[PDB]
Structures are given as C-alpha cells and as structure tokens.
Structure 1
Amino acid sequence: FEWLIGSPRWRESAAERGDVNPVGGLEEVLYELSPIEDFSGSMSLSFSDPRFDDVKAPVDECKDKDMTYAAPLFVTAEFINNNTGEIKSQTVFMGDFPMMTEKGTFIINGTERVVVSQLVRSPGVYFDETIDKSTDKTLHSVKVIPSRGAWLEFDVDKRDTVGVRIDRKRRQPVTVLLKALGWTSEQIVERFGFSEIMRSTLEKDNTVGTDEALLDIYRKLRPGEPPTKESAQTLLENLFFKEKRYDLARVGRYKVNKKLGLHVGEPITSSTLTEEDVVATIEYLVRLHEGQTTMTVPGGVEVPVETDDIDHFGNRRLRTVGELIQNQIRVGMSRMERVVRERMTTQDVEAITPQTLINIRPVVAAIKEFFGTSQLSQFMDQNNPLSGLTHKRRLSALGPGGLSRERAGLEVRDVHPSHYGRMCPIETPEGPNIGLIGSLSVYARVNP
C-alpha cells in the first residue's frame, strides 16, 4: 500500500533497493494515462502529481457510523491547447480513496476487511509438452500471456503443422503471421530451414504474400464485415506492438528477455513485443521438438530449451493489495479518459478547464465495486489476533484474472518444491479450498 500511495517510507526504501527510479502506483497510472490527446492533436490533458489530504474520520468513528476509512485524492491536471498555445494548470479532486489502517486492514461501509494477495501467473511465454493426443506423439504448445491485451497462442497439431491461435479464433498457419509482419518466403525459409515442419506448413500454405496475409488475418479477426488491407494493417499493428491496447508487464518483459535472452543489455526502455521475440518464440517452439539445450536467436544468447512449469514460484507471482487497487484504478481512469475525449469535442474551447473535462464517477464506482464485491476483498476474520494475522498473510489462487474454481485440479493444490520457505505446506483449509489458500512463510517477502 505504501508503494501504491508513494509514502516517504516507500521513498526511502527505494534508494536502498537501488531501484533509483522511484515511481508510485498512482504515479504510474498517471504516467500511462498522460497525456490525453484529442483526435485532432490540438489539445492535450496530462495528470502529473498525486496528493492526499488528511483522513476524513478516525477508524473508530468509521466503524461506528458505517463509513469508509478514506482520504481525499488530488491530482495536478495540466491542460495545453496547441492551437492557441495556452496552458491551464489546476488541482483536481479525484475521489475519496479508501486507506489502509496501521493494522493492515480496510474499513468498508463500517466493516473491517482484508485484501488477500492473489496468486496469478506472471506474464511471458510458457511452453508445455502435450502428450496424449489421439496418437502417442508429443505435441508442444506455447502461450504468450501479457499483463493486459490480447493473448497469443502457438500450437502444433496431430498432423505436423505450426499455427497461430489468436483470440480463440481458428488456428491459421504461422506463415500467415510471418508474412503479415513483412517477412518474405525467401527470408523466413532461411531462419526455419533446419525445421522441416515449417517447410511442410509452407508447402501446405493456402496463400503466400504480405498484403494478403494482412487481409486474411483481418478477416480472421473480423466477422460479418468486409475485408480491407488498410484496416488490416491498423488493427494488426494496434493489437500487439501498440502500447495502448497491449500491456506487456515490466515483469513480463523481464521474463521474456530472460527466457529468450534476446536483449540482456539493460534495454527496459519499452515494455512491448519485439518482432525478434516473436521470431524467438516461434523458433523456440519448433526447436523444442528437437529439444537442443543451447539455442541462439539472431541476437539471443545460449538459451536452454525446456518446457515451463506452471506451478513453479518463479513463473507464478502474486498481486498484492496495491497492485489489485491499481488494476481497478486503471480501468476507472480509462473510462474517465473516454469521458475526457467525449467532452473535448462538444465543449466550447476557451471555456473548458481541466475541471470540466474530468468526470470522476467511473473511478469512484470502480473503487466501490472492488472493495464491495471483489473476491479478494474478504470480511476480516478476527476470532483472535492470530486469525487476523494469518488472514492478512493469506495467498489465494482464486479470483478474477486467476483460475476459476472449476479450473482447480489436484496438481495446482499439491505442495510444490518451490513453496519451501515461501508458502507453508501445513497451513491450508481442510475443505473445498484445500491447496487454494495458503499462508505466507515467516521469513519470506514479496518481490517488487
């Protein structure tokens, strides 16, 4: 929570960490949202500084009057009109932000509550070996899962092929995507030449070309509407490489740059898919059938080729309370950005202010909906001090963004060897939540 706010306790901590670049969670949502540009590019609106006024009511008064322990949230919204070149700063009230107590809990509508750390798979590429097709033949699959955006999936069939299953759509041959990103047959045949499965898929290819690959990817993405190459290029470039609709996590960029070793020279400047990492993922997928230990991308570095464990605590992270609140705030603020863009047209210029563009109703609704109805916001369990203490340290695998309850198999619940010193193997429910709720270990701490 001190990270989410940016409190000076969290400031000092960062210098010690060496992560010299300190950026709070709210500050991060502001930097992602800023600026807000109109379709004409004439006027921009950028949020700069988060600040907190003192708390509205003490904890005891909140619990007595059925209130929410909260503090007012202000931002510095600077608007710029490029046409008249004028600047209008301001201090805008975002909403009454629920605050965490000193005991680590929240007060929502007069009831004390705890936000359980959720167990979710970290972004990146994950390879698995699917035996048990119709025939005793090892088919290897890989999923590229981001922090936000559209998923990517590469599979191999019973018959030897390679295809891209994109957004649950039917699997189109991967050569379609290769030629859609600008590659030509003479160019891709080179890199995958040692793989005959790719050669067989190109021999079984339906069409060979760049613009027609764009248009066919388009018609695959687009039902019931006429195909066009221009909108094909726009949508295909906007879904993955554009930072708006696609969020590759910093954790995700780190995972993919460690797994594929493509860029290890500290290039964290941008978190997005690089055409080289898609080339690396496809080359990794096809070479995993052979399984040679050392693999070198055209730029990669001696990457070991092996399938990934889904339950390993290097590939399974946890979203703490700050990140969950940040992920609801992000959605609320994106809706507010929609409202801002809608206002920017109908309103009379030279009458607008950063106050008239901003509508804080969706953000307040998002926060209220989270703390009221979210599965991860749980009624605090206080029979004795110990019950609350562990409840605040629980790790829950169920919730939005993680696996559902019907997706919980025996293999996710078992004690993993990576749980040693991280999650306690003894403390867990006896009933249907067995293996789904586990207590954090004593000496363990959560990574940034």
Structure 2
Amino acid sequence: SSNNSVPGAPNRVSFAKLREPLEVPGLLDVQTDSFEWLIGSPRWRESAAERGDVNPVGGLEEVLYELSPIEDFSGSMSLSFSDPRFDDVKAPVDECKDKDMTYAAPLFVTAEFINNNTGEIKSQTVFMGDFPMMTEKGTFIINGTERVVVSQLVRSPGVYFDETIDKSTDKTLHSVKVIPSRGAWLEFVRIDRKRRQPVTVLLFSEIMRSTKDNTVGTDEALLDIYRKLRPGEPPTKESAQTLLENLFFKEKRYDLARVGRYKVNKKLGLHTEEDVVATIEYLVRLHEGQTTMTVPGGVEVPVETDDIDHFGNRRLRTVGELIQNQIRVGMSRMERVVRERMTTQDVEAITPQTLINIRPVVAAIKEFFGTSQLSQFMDQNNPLSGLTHKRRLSALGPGGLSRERAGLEVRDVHPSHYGRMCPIETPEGPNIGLIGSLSVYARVNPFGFIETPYRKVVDGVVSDEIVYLTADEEDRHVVAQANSPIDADGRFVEPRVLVRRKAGEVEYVPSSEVDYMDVSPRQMVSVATAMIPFLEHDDANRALMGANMQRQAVPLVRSEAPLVGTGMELRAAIDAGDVVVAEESGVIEEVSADYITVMHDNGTRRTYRMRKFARSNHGTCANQCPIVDAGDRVEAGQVIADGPCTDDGEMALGKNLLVAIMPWEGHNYEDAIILSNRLVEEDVLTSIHIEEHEIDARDTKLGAEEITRDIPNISDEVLADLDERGIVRIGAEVRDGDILVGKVTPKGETELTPEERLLRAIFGEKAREVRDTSLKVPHGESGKVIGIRVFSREDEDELPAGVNELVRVYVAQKRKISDGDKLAGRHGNKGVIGKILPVEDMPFLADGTPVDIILNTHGVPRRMNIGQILETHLGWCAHSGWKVDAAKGVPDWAARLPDELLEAQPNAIVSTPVFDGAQEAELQGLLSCTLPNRDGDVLVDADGKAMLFDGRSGEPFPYPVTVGYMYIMKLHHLVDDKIHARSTGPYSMITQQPLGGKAQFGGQRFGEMECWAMQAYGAAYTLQELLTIKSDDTVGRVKVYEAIVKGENIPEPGIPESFKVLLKELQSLCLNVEVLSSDGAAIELRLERAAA
C-alpha cells in the first residue's frame, strides 16, 4: 500500500499500519529552492507569495540594493544597479561536460549613472559575467566536471550567553559573545583580542555598581579605546571619536545581520545602542539568576545561557547564500575601482560601462566554485550517492569551525536534530559528527533555520492542518509521537500520550495537553537510512555503516529491485534524477535504445535522449534503458527509463541472493563471504567500469611533441591496433601494457646513448632524436576501447598554452565478482569474498537448489544487527509467496496489520517501513504459511530453517540451517582496483625515494612503526636493506638489480640520499654540519665500464 501517488510505480505492498498524512517534499528542494531564491525566478516568486510576505527580494536583488548607490564622496555623482536579468544558457549540459566548459548564463543589469550637478542621467544595460548555473539535478558543471555545493553549518548572528566556572572557588561566572553578520565581535568589555577591559570604563545592579572604574566624562572612554586597541599612534581626541563612530553605528563597516537582527530583537525587545543596553542588563541579571528581565522599552525575555549547538541558534547557509556572499565580495571589490575612477575622470563623459570593471566579480565566482571546500566533486557512485550528497550538511569550511578546532561536543547528536538532521548517517572516520544529512521531511527556511512539519492538535484531536516549526518554535510546544494510538476523527484513544518537551526530555501527558504530532515515524531519518529494512532492529553503529555502504553500491549491468525494501526506493530513485521521467502526460510515439519520443495530447512532441554507457565521476557506468513500449500511454511523472541502479523506478542497489547462515569450512571465517559460482556465470554481480585515459602533445624545450603512429623501434605487430594517427582503434581489446596513443617527445643530443650515437652516425640517420613517450595502459587494467575524443590546436579547439594536441581514450571493462571484492547488506554487515565455490559443492536445498551466498553465523549476534535475519525470513516469504488461512476467521497474529498481505504470489514486492511495518509475530505467521515449490514441497519450516546437503561429500548437514533471501550490494571496493605490486619504478626527484600511489606505480611505505617492529625482531640487515638499497641508495639499487639479473650475491649497501638532503637542508639553515672519520677531518660526499 505504497507508491500510489507516482503513476506506473509498481505495487510494493506495505506492512505499515499508520496513514501517511504528508508526502516526501522535493528531496532536491534544499538546493533548487535556494538557487531559485538567489536568481529570483518566478518559481521562487510564487513560493514566497504562498509562504512569505508581499515584498520578496532575491539574492542578487538584495546584493544590488545593498550596493546601491555607488556615490562620490562629495555626493556629486551616484551609480545605481537594478533589474538583474539573465540571457539564455551558453551551451547545454552534455556539451559543457564534453568540452570541459562551465554551464553558465550571461548576467545583465541596468546601471543608472547620475551627475548631481549636471542632471545628466544616462541609463545603460551592463553585462556582469558568465554566471554559473544550477542544473535540473541540482549540480553545477565547472571545467566539465559535475560538482555539488554542500550546505554549511554555522552560528547565526546574535548574542549568546554561557555559564562557566572559575578556577578560584568554582564560582558561577557568566560570559557573553556577539557574533555579527559582518565585522568584528566582543565579549564581557573585552573587544578584538584586547583583554583587561572594564565594562564600566567605556560608557540594584549587583556588580555594575561595584565598577572599580575611575573616570568621568566621555573623553576618557573615548581615548581608552584608541589607547587600548589602536596602538602605534599617539593618543588623540579626533581619531578615537572617528573610529568609535565607524565601529558599530556605521553600517558600511558593521553589517547588522537580518537573521541576526531578528534573533537578537527576539532575545531582548521587539524594536544599535538599545541592544547594548539590553545586553549589559542581560549579563547583569544573569549573574543574578532572575527568570525574566525588564529593559527600558523591552520586556519578556528569559535570563538564560544559550546552547551553541541548538538548531535555533545554529543555521546552515545553502548554496544560494554562499554564492550571494561571494558575489557581494566581488561587487565590493568592483565598487572600490568604481569610486576610484569616479575621482579621476571627468563628469558627463563617464558612462556606466566606463567605470564598471567586472574582473573582480568574475574572479570571485571562479575562485568560489574552484577552490571552496563546499564545491565538491559530486559523489556519483550511484544515484543514492548523489542524492545524499546534495542533501548533506557539513560544519567545516571557510566561515565555520576547523577540522581541528572542532572538539567532541560539536559532533554530538543534539535533541534539536530530531526531524532536521538524521542521527544515523554520518562518516565513521575523522569527519564523523561533522557531516550529516538532511532529514527526509525537513525543509530549510528563509533565515537558514531547518524547519520540520507537524500535524496541528486541537483539543486532543489530531488535525490535518500541517505546520512547519523551527527548533525554537518546536521547543516551545509539546510534540506527540507518530506511533500514538488515534481513533478516526483524530482522537487519542489512550488517556495520555507520550510527548517531547523543550528540555529534550520525554513525558506522558494527558491528551488535552498536546499541541502538535509527528507527521510520521522515521521523520528523524535521512533518505539512505530510511531504506534499511528493520532499522529499529539494528544498532546505530551497524545502521550508520549500512547507510554509508548503500551510498557505495556500484551499478550492475542488470539491476534488480530488492525483494524486501522500505517505501523509499521509488521516491529516492525519482528525486535522485538518474531516471528519465515524463514531464508531460502523453503517448509514446517512438522508442529506441537511443531516445524516447512522447506525443502529448495537445500535439506537442517531447523527446528524451538516453545516457548510454556514460562514465561517472568514480568510474561507475551510468546507462539508461527505456521501460515503455511504442503506443504506451504515460502519465506525467511516470518513469520512462531506468537509470544505473534503478528497476521500474525503484532504487535497486543490489541483488536478491539465496543466503544460508552457517559456518562453512572456514572459508567464511572472520567476516569472509562464500559465493556460488552462478553469480559469475550469470553475471549477477557483474558491473561495468569506464576509465578515461588522457594524453597531450605540447611544447618542450627541445621542440614540440607529436602524436604519431611511428614510434622508435616498435614491432609492426604491436601497433597492429593503432590507426594512422597512432591512436588505438575503437573496439580494440587492450591488455595492460598496450599502446593507447602514440607520442614522441623531442630528445636532446647529449642523451643519445653511445649505441644510438653510432647507429645514427653510421646509417646516416636523421636528426629527429625523439623519445617514446606514448600513452600506455597502466598495470592491472584491460578492456575494450569504448570511445576516442580528440582536440587539435590546428582546428579551432581551445587548449592551454603550448599544448598542440590532446586525445582521450575511454576504456570499458566488465568486472565479474571475484575473490577480494567487498559485498554488504543494508545492515552494516560487510565482508570480502573469501572464495567462490563451484555450484556443485555449494550447500543446496531438498530440490537441488544450491544456495548463492554463505554468511558465517559467528558474525551476526555480536554486531547487534539481527535486522539481516528478519530480512532473510521476510525475503524467503516473498520469494515463495504465502496464503494465510482465512476460513473460520483471520488469526490473531495477522489481525492487526495485514490488509492485502493475507496472500502474495511468488516473487512479491513488499516494503517494511522503518519504525512501522513488519512485526515479529506477523513475520512468524507468514513463515508458517509459505507456499510450496513445483513439487508441493515446503522447503523452509516455520523457524525459517531448512535441511541442506553438503555439495562436496553428499551427506546432509545434521541440523536445519536458516536459509532465506537477502539483499546484497556490490560495494565499490574491488581487488582489480586495489591489487598492486612493484619491483622497481619511478623515484621522486627530491627525496630520490620511490613515488607513492598505484597510479604512479609507486612503492609501499615502510613507516616508522614498521621500523620499530623490524628492530624488535633484531632484523638489522632486513631493515638496512629496506631503508637503503630498496629506497635511497641511487647506485646501490641499480647494483642490486644488476646482481639479481646476473645471479650474483646482493652487494653491500651505500648511503641514503635522504641523509645527504638532510645535511643540505641543515646547511641552508646556517648550521655547519660535518661527517668525520675515526681520527680525521670531514669526509666529503659526491667510464671504464662503458668502453667495454
């Protein structure tokens, strides 16, 4: 009973027992609505009219109003910007990806210049730059790569009070801090890293009367600030006055926030100096401890210390606002030169275009999108990756805290996160607690505060009027729970109800005391987390791991929706934006492996091009396939084609495998996994991986490289797959080592070997003298050449300086599941494949059906994730189908929930939502009435177990084993990517040690702790060898190779080059270091074989 809203969406029967009173909002709205505010689109106009005041202003309109008008110091001239308009887009998205461009639109504005003494008003339309644009999917394209702007967590402007304890006698010491929208701050009156500031030396009070302060008049407090914060200059009477007037009263310097001003006026008074008086009164009357406070003109404020992690005092700046702030920076940097040109030039001859240099705004936008920590390479292993990435909230970055100045209380789950930031989905590693994901139903508001929806309660009556509350508004109310008994008409059945109050604590209050109720369970969860069946049965560690590992599934050649899922797979796949969706209801007029054309009813034609075998940012294969047939009538929103990890419109991150839970000969020891070789023969876990090799011919000192099929002394047979250009041919199968693009690089004459010198002399060779710098395929890689793209400087192809030609070979490979690959269930139950057994010796059921995967029993109980077991049971139920016996009534176990679950055909699609859905009793009931197989044999008994035969000896295993169907994902951690060895390779020019990294054919690092270990063994010679002739001895290593090749003993080791380099660095530090003999001076460091 789910997915009824989405047309054509398959029928996934749901065990849920609660009505869904609110659908999932646009799971990308967090990004879109933000950008649509920034731009001022009609969408945002209507959305603000529906839930906002009558005077809306977009991000750019606001920036312009703030900047206007650029005025001369004498007030003689004034420049005013207005009416931000966009042209159409320069190039489409796929075009920008192909050409390595930046999807953007030209920005235009009306610039009105006025000379106050000539009356001349020359209006003009000025162009501000190529403003980068947000795509349908909510991303950006910069330099041809797709990027996401992750929302940032930061402290909203305002004043905040806290209560510390002094090291004197544990006295309760109050402190305050004022965080501004822009400018400096202060504390208590210490200001700008200058302590020892009496609060009374700058202007019933308990200690305000005690201030100690010795002065009278206004010049003392005016001169003390210039003598205490503006040093390096004598004490003056005018400069201190000027600075004090330009500190906080001045609006140019000190930017009073809008959100900040709202928060502060809510903290002190409905309607600056008033604020400072209220703040002093607040600190005083907080040192006392009184409940409320009365300020002149303001009233009704609770005297209380503020929580720094509360979501009513912690906001997030969406993409729109980050862009707005970068634009403000560029605009101020431009206004500087605008005034600086107003000064010099003559009036009546300066047009808006003459004094407006946009270079700083362009550079600001560019630097933001290209260097900000919040513009991130889009995680697109699969649709769920990108969907969560867009909805993500991180606290690091410019303007937030530091990855090292962020302690542990920052990373703690605050009670105000309920329904706003999911508490499960967060990284396990260093970034833990710092990167969360937006809750499913959550929604950002104009001020950057995360609101969440609740059903209104009128006289213990759950209504259908929904209301969105922020953390503050919520705290001030009593929120019922979603799984609260309610009779029709919205009436709590129980005398009282469980609820949450402001203290972050729960209570059991009479029904007439409830204000709002949760819209649904799982309201606190994120999208990924909401997709773990039987979540409540899993510990938070393994559940966090399950979410994180769902975001790592690799798309498989053929995708299969989970036999048992939540209700979120469909909506997740759709919002993610990797499936094609019918924008307008019509009739399929044509369908091909290439495109899909629908004829709308009003005669309109719309066509959709299928992404076919597209490489993703992480090598996964984005490949769409249509799921409509010619003549099919499709409604608006219906899914037209499946994406990479989707099936009929549902997130299909893995496959349904026949699992047996039992230790099998140790091959699944200590988390290993055993797979049936079927999964290889039938490609059940096979995936496609597309890599992009690139190579350019550029200008060198000795000339210019040339991409040529003619490479020095290469066998005609080796080039057999190269075209005339020296580029491999499409569809060619390339093993590791083959050539991909031939290239020669001008070589100097001094480098020619003596052999080559004589060869070019005797045979009268030419003066080419090049080196083979051709692009070869790296180790552990192979595949068919999917594609070839090429860019020539000859043609009108734009490339960097000195780069003549540039070719890119796109190579695909089909990876079969293999030993070493990493699989995992949705319950944080990960493991590498220990062995892939022949189907014949796999344990099999009575009917010869061999299991597909053997999961070691010893791994389940201690991890506290029996969720996988419940899933196995329900999955077998769904794979066999069932029929609850209704004759003589409906059994009590199936009475509560089951409505259309009383029977189900084999391979039925069922969803068990989190915190609702399948109950243990109902699971057991279904397990009792399993349907039989072909021969009318019930294979899995009422415990969920079944006898199995040892496919090796033939004898049956003595005890029944739990067999079932489990959803297993192929996580993007594959041996093919991680195997790496090296005998000898490139070294670093600085340390002369082996390069690091597989991509560079590097060597393993023998770290300090490894040398400790080696010493503990007493393996002196092994440690020396590892550290001298394998790393740094520039002659020792070549000697070692020469000795191995000629069957001679390994020579004695020399001197690590890194030591010479250390000596050189010391010397450069003016330290005279010197190596000495037993009794001698400093030792110094620094043909016949060739002639032979």
TM-based fold match above 0.5: yes
CA contact (8 A) 2:115 2:348 kept: no
1:118-148 deviation line (CA, Å, top 9, x unaligned) = 0001100000001143431111110011110
1:197-248 deviation line (CA, Å, top 9, x unaligned) = 11222xx214322022112112223110122222222211211111101111
Secondary structure of the corresponding residue to residue 243 of structure 1: coil
Please give the alpha-carbon distance, in whole angstroms, between the structure 1 residues aligned to 2:334 and 2:101: 25
CA contact (8 A) 1:114 1:392 kept: yes
1:343-399 deviation line (CA, Å, top 9, x unaligned) = 011112222110011010111111110000001111100000000000000000001
CA contact (8 A) 2:180 2:256 kept: yes
Tell me the CA shift for residue 48 of structure 1: 1.1
Moved more, 306-315 or 248-257: 248-257
Please give the alpha-carbon distance, in whole angstroms, between the structure 2 residues aligned to 1:284 and 1:29: 34
Please give the alpha-carbon distance, in whole angstroms, between the structure 2 residues aligned to 1:196 and 1:89: 61
CA contact (8 A) 1:56 1:70 kept: yes
1:267-304 deviation line (CA, Å, top 9, x unaligned) = xxxxxxx2111011011001101110011111111211
1:80-103 deviation line (CA, Å, top 9, x unaligned) = 000111111001110100000000
Q: Is 1:298 matched with 2:296?
A: yes
Secondary structure of the corresponding residue to residue 233 of structure 1: helix
Secondary structure of the corresponding residue to residue 354 of structure 1: coil
CA contact (8 A) 1:118 1:396 kept: yes
CA contact (8 A) 2:178 2:186 kept: yes
Q: Is 1:416 matched with 2:414?
A: yes
CA contact (8 A) 2:421 2:438 kept: yes
Please give the alpha-carbon distance, in whole angstroms, between the structure 2 residues aligned to 1:126 and 1:425: 25
Where in structure 2 are the equivalents of 1:182-201 lying within 5 Å?
Answer: 194-201=204-211
1:291-348 deviation line (CA, Å, top 9, x unaligned) = 1001111111121100000000000000000000001010110010100011011112
Tell me the CA shift for residue 168 of structure 1: 1.4
Where in structure 2 are the equivalents of 1:123-142 lying within 5 Å?
Answer: 123-142=157-176
Please give the alpha-carbon distance, in whole angstroms, between the structure 1 residues aligned to 2:433 and 2:56: 36
Please give the alpha-carbon distance, in whole angstroms, between the structure 2 residues aligned to 1:400 and 1:348: 41
Aligned to 1:36: 70
Q: 2:83 aligns with which of 26, 41, 49?
A: 49
CA contact (8 A) 2:118 2:348 kept: no
CA contact (8 A) 2:72 2:339 kept: yes
Tell me the CA shift for residue 70 of structure 1: 0.4
Secondary structure of the corresponding residue to residue 257 of structure 1: helix
Tell me the CA shift for residue 77 of structure 1: 0.6
Q: 2:102 aligns with which of 68, 91, 116?
A: 68
Please give the alpha-carbon distance, in whole angstroms, between the structure 1 residues aligned to 2:382 and 2:96: 22
Secondary structure of the corresponding residue to residue 317 of structure 1: strand
CA contact (8 A) 2:182 2:254 kept: yes
Tell me the CA shift for residue 177 of structure 1: 2.5
Greater RCO between the two (CA within 8 Å, min separation 6)? 1
Distance 1:43 1:350, change over 3 A: same
Please give the alpha-carbon distance, in whole angstroms, between the structure 1 residues aligned to 2:68 and 2:196: 37
Tell me the CA shift for residue 18 of structure 1: 3.2
Aligned to 1:101: 135
Aligned to 1:191: none
Where in structure 2 are the equivalents of 1:11-410 lying within 5 Å?
Answer: 11-154=45-188, 164-178=189-203, 194-201=204-211, 204-263=212-271, 274-410=272-408
CA contact (8 A) 1:36 1:45 kept: yes
Please give the alpha-carbon distance, in whole angstroms, between the structure 2 residues aligned to 1:381 and 1:86: 54
CA contact (8 A) 2:38 2:58 kept: yes
Moved more, 231-240 or 322-331: 231-240
CA contact (8 A) 1:3 1:24 kept: yes
Please give the alpha-carbon distance, in whole angstroms, between the structure 1 residues aligned to 2:90 and 2:229: 49
Tell me the CA shift for residue 262 of structure 1: 4.7
1:2-35 deviation line (CA, Å, top 9, x unaligned) = 0000000001111111311110100000000000
Secondary structure of the corresponding residue to residue 436 of structure 2: strand
CA contact (8 A) 2:206 2:284 kept: no
Please give the alpha-carbon distance, in whole angstroms, between the structure 2 residues aligned to 1:374 and 1:220: 36
Please give the alpha-carbon distance, in whole angstroms, between the structure 2 residues aligned to 1:227 and 1:86: 46
- Which TM-score applies when normalising by structure 2? 0.37
Please give the alpha-carbon distance, in whole angstroms, between the structure 1 residues aligned to 2:169 and 2:326: 45
Tell me the CA shift for residue 62 of structure 1: 0.4
CA contact (8 A) 2:202 2:220 kept: no
CA contact (8 A) 1:150 1:240 kept: no
Moved more, 231-240 or 286-295: 231-240
Identity %: 100
Moved more, 73-82 or 12-21: 12-21
Please give the alpha-carbon distance, in whole angstroms, between the structure 1 residues aligned to 2:79 and 2:437: 44
Please give the alpha-carbon distance, in whole angstroms, between the structure 2 residues aligned to 1:206 and 1:54: 67
Please give the alpha-carbon distance, in whole angstroms, between the structure 1 residues aligned to 2:146 and 2:46: 29
Secondary structure of the corresponding residue to residue 174 of structure 2: strand
Secondary structure of the corresponding residue to residue 405 of structure 1: coil
Please give the alpha-carbon distance, in whole angstroms, between the structure 2 residues aligned to 1:85 and 1:233: 36
CA contact (8 A) 1:176 1:217 kept: no
1:245-271 deviation line (CA, Å, top 9, x unaligned) = 1111111111011111252xxxxxxxx
Moved more, 383-392 or 143-152: 143-152
CA contact (8 A) 1:311 1:416 kept: yes
CA contact (8 A) 2:175 2:283 kept: yes
Please give the alpha-carbon distance, in whole angstroms, between the structure 1 residues aligned to 2:324 and 2:224: 37
Please give the alpha-carbon distance, in whole angstroms, between the structure 1 residues aligned to 2:220 and 2:287: 30
1:395-419 deviation line (CA, Å, top 9, x unaligned) = 0000111111111111110100000
Secondary structure of the corresponding residue to residue 105 of structure 2: strand
CA contact (8 A) 1:262 1:277 kept: no
CA contact (8 A) 1:128 1:142 kept: yes
Secondary structure of the corresponding residue to residue 393 of structure 2: strand
Tell me the CA shift for residue 112 of structure 1: 0.3
Distance 1:226 1:398, change over 3 A: same
Moved more, 309-318 or 403-412: 403-412
CA contact (8 A) 1:148 1:246 kept: yes
CA contact (8 A) 1:147 1:249 kept: yes
CA contact (8 A) 2:291 2:302 kept: yes
Secondary structure of the corresponding residue to residue 162 of structure 2: strand
CA contact (8 A) 1:37 1:43 kept: yes
Secondary structure of the corresponding residue to residue 96 of structure 1: strand
Larger helix proportion of the pair:
1
Please give the alpha-carbon distance, in whole angstroms, between the structure 1 residues aligned to 2:351 and 2:229: 40
Secondary structure of the corresponding residue to residue 165 of structure 1: coil
Tell me the CA shift for residue 444 of structure 1: 0.4
Tell me the CA shift for residue 59 of structure 1: 0.4
Please give the alpha-carbon distance, in whole angstroms, between the structure 2 residues aligned to 1:77 and 1:219: 44
Gaps of 5+ in 1: 155-163, 179-193, 264-273
Please give the alpha-carbon distance, in whole angstroms, between the structure 1 residues aligned to 2:287 and 2:223: 31
Gaps of 5+ in 2: 1-34, 445-1092
Moved more, 341-350 or 63-72: 341-350
CA contact (8 A) 1:262 1:276 kept: no
Secondary structure of the corresponding residue to residue 296 of structure 1: coil
CA contact (8 A) 1:51 1:73 kept: yes
